[PDB]
Design a protein around this ligand. Structure first.
Ligand code: NDP
Ligand code: MTX
Length: 151
């Protein structure tokens, strides 16, 4: 199983604000869709609420500590470790966020797919700092930009 983090972030690593995104970038969302189509996507409960519904044509997996919580359309796990353990036989697992999930996933991450937006927005949640010496750029396309890093 390859563990991949996919995130859209600005130059300060901002990813969220008041549990929404600080932008709307249609080019990013269609990038996110093709990349995640047909694969297990792992998200936190707050990120699920932000989206508002299961993303179609994907196995939506939500991590919560709420034991009575049921979300229609999605699989619930009570830790990232229970999720990853249940997806052992999968060839790729895609972690979509948010800030808390990214931070816990990062040290297990094999690959990162990052949209870095050239701007500075106001917000309150961030993508965790990664040691640039531990990763290598496998692809860079400057449109914002798409950056693929492999560990
Ligand atoms: N720019 C981007 O690419 C992305 C941005 N975002 C943005 O990020 C923000 C949401 O991120 P954030 O607020 O950090 O919240 P998260 O999306 O990380 O979800 C947090 C919740 O996930 C559950 N959780 C997290 N870790 C664990 C664990 N180890 N075990 C059990 N449960 C766990 C808890 O749920 P519970 O409270 O139910 O117990 C926790 O409250 C929003 O603004 C969203 O729009 C989100 C994804 C991608
Ligand atoms: C809040 N949230 C989390 C979110 C947003 N942008 C991201 N962008 C990137 N690059 N990576 C992420 N993990 C990411 N996550 C969202 C919000 C909406 C949709 C969404 O409606 N996407 C649909 C449709 C997108 C479209 O309109 O084409 C899809 O099928 O992927 C996805 C994630």
């Amino acid at each position: 199983m390859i563990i991949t983090l996919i995130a859209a972030m600005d130059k300060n690593r901002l990813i969220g604000r008041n549990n929404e995104l600080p932008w709307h970038l249609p080019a990013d969302l269609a990038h996110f869709k093709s990349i995640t189509l047909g694969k297990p996507i792992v998200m936190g409960r707050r990120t699920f609420d932000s989206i508002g519904k299961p993303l179609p044509h994907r196995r939506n997996i939500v991590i919560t500590q709420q034991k009575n919580l049921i979300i229609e359309g999605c699989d619930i796990f009570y830790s990232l470790d229970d999720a990853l353990s249940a997806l052992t036989k999968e060839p790729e697992v895609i972690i979509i966020g948010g800030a808390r999930i990214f931070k816990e996933a990062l040290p297990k991450a094999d690959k990162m797919i990052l949209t870095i937006i050239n701007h500075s927005f106001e917000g309150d949640v961030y993508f965790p700092e990664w040691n640039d010496k531990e990763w290598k750029i496998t692809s860079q396309i400057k449109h914002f930009q798409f950056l693929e890093l492999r560990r």
